[PDB]
């Protein structure tokens, strides 16, 4: 007869070995070094634009590289590409599922993508104008819902899934070029490194994994949360990233250190974090909570610097433009807003 119980121990002893290697470099926390740094002024952003057009809860949004066009996915089975400066709608795309978990904007503006409980990643060419009937490519493959997706360029997109996987696709052939396996639970979100050579992913196993795109494998596995990681975001310089989880904390992970540099939490905060995004300089970490609230964290000092949208319980998702000029918020009341 066979046995795997022993094989279950080498994993734990190895994990135990990595814990120590990490504990040997944990001399001090980020907050220690930033103790003398002045706290930022109370951050108070104002609504400048209100985007009207959706007829249901906004599930996800994503800014276009020009920091002006943005796409929003809603429970109304629609994808809308907006001109944020004028609040005008540029395109409107009818989807087949109301259950859209994510949407992406190709850095070129030629394409936009989205997917959800359909387990598929649909791509829309905005140039050939597929607004009414066409759907460039439907990326079938995942055996679980499509949690997130981000374009590397026009012929390459990376997706995360509830099937425990992440995949790199060639848009032209429509084949799962690469498959990133390793997580033991549902992949909830991913974040591309600025250089797009690397990317990171958060999952329900409570771990974030750094993956090499060109190479096709996991470089490292971060841990610390005892709960599901629901959101992840790369830091502007590519050497770190932040995570948000069901454990009501956000954590700053440094790649070179292979461990958390800081945690952001407050006793008064008890809901899971489902949205994290950095300001342009990375001084600010904005977190969106399951109760629809959003807190602005001073990434250096680990104290709350402010509140986005006055705790009106109206934020369902958010995003910061590349130029770091504005933040967008989606809402369950069907409206999107832009804050400065």
């Amino acid at each position: 007869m066979s046995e795997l119980d022993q094989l279950r121990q080498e994993a734990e002893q190895l994990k135990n070995q990595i814990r120590d290697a990490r504990k040997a470099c944990a001399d001090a926390t980020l907050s220690q070094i930033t103790n003398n740094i002045d706290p930022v002024g109370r951050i108070q952003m104002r609504t400048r634009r209100t985007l009207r057009g959706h007829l249901a809860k906004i599930y996800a949004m994503h800014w276009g590289t020009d920091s002006r066009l943005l796409l929003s996915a809603s429970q109304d089975g629609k994808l809308i590409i907006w001109d944020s400066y004028t609040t005008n709608k540029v395109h409107a795309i009818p989807l087949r599922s109301s259950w859209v978990m994510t949407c992406a904007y190709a850095p070129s503006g030629n394409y936009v993508a989205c997917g959800g409980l359909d387990n598929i990643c649909s791509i829309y060419n905005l140039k050939t104008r597929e607004g009414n009937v066409r759907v460039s490519r439907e990326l079938a493959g995942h055996t679980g819902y499509l949690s997130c997706c981000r374009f590397l360029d026009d012929n390459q997109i990376v997706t995360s899934s509830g099937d425990t996987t992440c995949a790199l696709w060639d848009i032209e052939t429509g084949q799962q070029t690469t498959t990133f396996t390793g997580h033991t639970g549902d992949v909830m979100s991913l974040s591309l490194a600025p250089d797009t050579r690397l990317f990171v992913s958060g999952a329900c196993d409570a771990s974030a994994k750094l993956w090499d795109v060109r190479e096709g494998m996991c470089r490292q596995t971060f841990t610390g949360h005892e709960s599901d990681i629901n959101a992840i975001c790369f830091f502007p310089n590519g050497n770190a990233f932040a995570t948000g989880s069901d454990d009501a904390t956000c954590r700053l992970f440094d790649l070179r250190a292979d461990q958390e540099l800081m945690t952001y939490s407050h006793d008064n905060i008890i809901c899971g974090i489902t949205s994290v995004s950095f300001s342009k300089s990375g001084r600010l970490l904005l977190a969106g909570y399951d109760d629809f609230n959003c807190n602005v964290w001073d990434a250096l000092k680990a104290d709350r610097a402010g509140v986005l949208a006055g705790h009106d319980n109206r934020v369902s998702c958010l995003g910061v433009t590349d130029d770091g000029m504005a933040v967008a918020t989606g809402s369950w009341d069907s409206f999107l807003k832009i804050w400065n």
Partner: protein
Amino acid sequence: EGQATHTGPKGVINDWRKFKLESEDGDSIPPSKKEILRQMSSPQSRDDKDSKERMSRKMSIQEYELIHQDKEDEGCLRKYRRQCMQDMHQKLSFGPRYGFVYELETGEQFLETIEKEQKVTTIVVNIYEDGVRGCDALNSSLECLAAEYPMVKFCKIRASNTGAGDRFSSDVLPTLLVYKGGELISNFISVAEQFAEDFFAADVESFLNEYGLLPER
């Protein structure tokens, strides 16, 4: 709260689930579960440490199963969409309690009001002093606002009565502080600056709405 169920992918999953809890054609009634097994099918409720982890598979085979054997009724879909927004407003809509700007006379009173208040209530406190330009116009606006947003508690206090003298010079007056759930949500030094000399309640409102400090739309 614990695990997320309203936002992000978890939100979509929970939304799809609750949807069926109404779609089937009756919910807590006899047309749905009778085994009192569940109010809904749910995944990841009890940790299955067989693999060494607090088991977290949000979508089960039976869930993904329906997904293909599902009859997404367009009509039943729009109905559900309206019902979700209606439900959320309802929960965010708490009774019209107040309707007047209340005068706080001491620092102890200020601390007492934000401290003993329901955590769901927004408190707009106005720190002013007579004669200081802007104050009277703000107080007038507030009285009209307090009467329109009875679920928001508005208050006013002389900088002198705060118990922090010099800290509040006419240079930063009037200052408008907003609290909710025990915490300061906004601090507007020289609020009067945000408006034109002659300002009224609708201006103050447009302003507070834009920071998302006012309920009900």
